[PDB]
Each structure stands twice: as C-alpha cells, then as structure tokens.
C-alpha cells in the first residue's frame, strides 16, 4: 500500500499468539491503569504512554493485561482530548509546514507536501466524521487550525 508515496516497505509489530499471559508478569490491572491515568494527567499520548510503559515498565501490551485499549481508558476516566491523536498530529504538521511556506513561497516542494498532508487530513476527518467521533460539520481550514492546535 503506502498512499502518498510509492514506497512499499513492511515494518510493524508482530503481535504474539499469546492473547493472555505474560505468565512471568505480576502486578494487577489496578497498577497499570493507575499508570496510564496519571501519565494522562501528566498529559502524554496513548502512543507516548504505551511506548513508555512497554519500555521502562514491563507491559507487553496494555490491552492484554487489561482487557481495554489505552485511549478507551483515557475516555473512560474522562481524559480523551478534543480530536483524536493521528488527526491532531497531521494538523500540527500541516501547521508547521504552512508556517515554513509563509516564510518562503519559493519552495514549491513544501506546497506539494502541504497539499498531500492536508489531503490526508481531509480524508481522515471524513472517516472520523462518518463514525460520529467528530461533529458532522467538522472541517479543516488553516486559518482556524493554527489556533485549534494551540
């Protein structure tokens, strides 16, 4: 696949057959759920949080030791932010790129890339809006995204 290029690299997570376990793992649900939530107070992303936990701590996958995905925990304790993580970071990027282009319009490369990024933003937002996780009138425009990120 790989949309906005013709790159065809394979790179991911080989998820274990072990839907349960980690056998050698102690603690409880309580432990890691508190972890998640307090890190959410600190203000980290479920990607950030999961990476951190899987590193310094000993959590193979948060959903296994706790039958629930991270963002679901966040939303459950009222920690879900305005818009999702991927859409957020897309808009943030498009924002930085756009500032770069405001700084020199001579860079057509940045134009092309800005088009791509924003197209991804629009397609994604269309998906999100379809599944009701975004108000069915939600649209991205630059002049408002500047604020919307910050």
């Amino acid at each position: 696949g790989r949309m906005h290029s013709a790159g065809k690299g394979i790179s991911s997570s080989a998820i274990p057959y072990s839907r349960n376990a980690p056998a050698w793992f102690k603690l409880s649900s309580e432990s890691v759920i508190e972890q998640i939530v307090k890190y959410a107070r600190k203000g980290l992303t479920p990607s950030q949080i999961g990476v951190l936990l899987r590193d310094a701590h000993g959590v193979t996958q948060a959903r296994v030791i706790t039958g629930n995905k991270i963002m679901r925990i966040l939303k459950s304790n009222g920690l879900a932010p305005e818009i999702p993580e991927d859409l957020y970071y897309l808009i943030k990027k498009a924002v930085s790129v756009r500032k770069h282009l405001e700084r020199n319009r001579k860079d057509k490369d940045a134009k092309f890339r800005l088009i791509l990024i924003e197209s991804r933003i629009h397609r994604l937002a269309r998906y999100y809006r379809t599944v009701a996780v975004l108000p069915p009138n939600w649209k991205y425009e630059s002049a408002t995204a500047s604020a919307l990120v910050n």
Partner: protein, 155 residues
Amino acid sequence: STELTVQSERAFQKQPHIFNNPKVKTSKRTKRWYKNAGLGFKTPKTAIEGSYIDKKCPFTGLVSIRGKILTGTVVSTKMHRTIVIRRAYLHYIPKYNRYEKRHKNVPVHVSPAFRVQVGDIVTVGQCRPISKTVRFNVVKVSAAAGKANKQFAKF
C-alpha cells in the same frame, strides 16, 4: 411541517361537518375526528392529540391510502407539509449481464402529525392526486434522526 398559530389562514380552518355546539359547554373546546389507514398503519398519538387541520392528512384529513405502498430516503424537507424522497434501485442490463445504480425522487405529502428531517427513511402510501406532482402520503417514519445527539460535545 406546519407548527404554531393553527388559525393562520384568511379562511377559517375547520374539519368539515364536525359540529361543536356552543350551548353545550364542553371541556375540550373543539370536537376532533379521525380514522385509520389500514394495512397495519397505526394512527400516531400526535395525530389525535394534535390540533392541526390538514385535509390532506391520511389520519385526520379527507384522503384515502390505497394502491402502492413505497419506502424511501428523505432528501428534501424545505417545502411546507410536503417532502421529496429519493428511492434508489439497480437496473439490470442483459447485454452486459450487470446492474446500474438508478434513482427517482418522489414528491409526497407529509401530515403535521409526523416530524420529519432530511435522512429519515419513510414509508408512504399512494392516495389521490393531492397536488400537481403529489400522489403519495407519508404514512410511517421507519427511521429516527440518524443518531443526531450522538455527535454531542466534549466533557
């Protein structure tokens, strides 16, 4: 659609031959008539409770449901007491042995008993020529509001 004022016409809106005597002190003010379409069509509470008039009402008006009974997706509710619905289908073409997405927009009356919105799948019943284009009458709202409130705010 309708709503408000009820008596908002130059003429007096009244159900024909439904005399309510002044001398006979009633506690309902106005005497209401109604029936049932048939075919399984429950006459909604808002029709017998309500105080609208609509002579083009299937449940309180002077029309009759008979002939075709169709369903469709509401595409237009911009007019008054009448809507347009898109009925989609697929057409078989032999030479290619395949189908093609077609559609027709049917004009259809809608009583002030119902409360329609663009998207509500609806069931209509063919009546007599009501207007220049209208031969159907909304007879049941199968949908709801497409989970509208399910797009609410933050927290």
